[PDB]
């Protein structure tokens, strides 16, 4: 039947990393979430995300969305649709993608596994 990767926006990560058009609404799977060091500032969560074809490790959650992580709605394996995001390219070429607005379409436990065979984007 229909493959699980059919749920994900295959090619969105390449598009974001090349064209940088933020007027798209890609559906992505969360692979991992990690808090980073922030000192006296609110926690920031870095995400490893998948579009089914690629993963990218440089996604960041806007802190306004921290409750999604802290109340355990946005977690490893869940599928989200991104509705607003910002691209911030660093001096070394790394392109950080900041997720501002999103919908959790399908919970981690309704998915259950990492979907497909995505490979890290590095081109």
Q: What is the domain count for the chain?
A: 1
Domain that holds residue 89: 1-123
122 Cβ neighbours under 8 A, 6+ residues apart: none
The Cα-based distances of 106 to 41, 62, 113 in angstroms read: 30, 20, 12
Give me the CATH number covering residue 104: 2.40.50.140
Q: Regarding beta strands 27-36 and 79-89, do their DSSP bridges make them parallel or antiparallel, or are they unpaired?
A: antiparallel
**Burial of 48 from C-beta contacts in 10 A (0-12 / 13-18 / 19+):** middle
Reported structure resolution in angstroms: 1.5
């Amino acid at each position: 039947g229909s493959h699980m990767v059919g749920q994900l926006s295959e090619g969105a990560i390449a598009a974001i990393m090349q064209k940088g058009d933020t007027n798209i609404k890609p559906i992505l799977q969360v692979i991992n979430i990690r808090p980073i060091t922030t000192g006296n500032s609110p926690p920031r969560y870095r995400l490893l995300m998948s579009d089914g074809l690629n993963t990218l490790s440089s996604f960041m959650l806007a802190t306004q969305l921290n409750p999604l992580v802290e109340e355990e709605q946005l977690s490893s394996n869940c599928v989200c649709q991104i509705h607003r995001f910002i691209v911030n390219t660093l001096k070394d070429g790394r392109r950080v993608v900041i997720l501002m607005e999103l919908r959790v379409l399908k919970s981690a436990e309704a998915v259950g596994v990492k979907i497909g065979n995505p490979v890290p984007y590095n081109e």
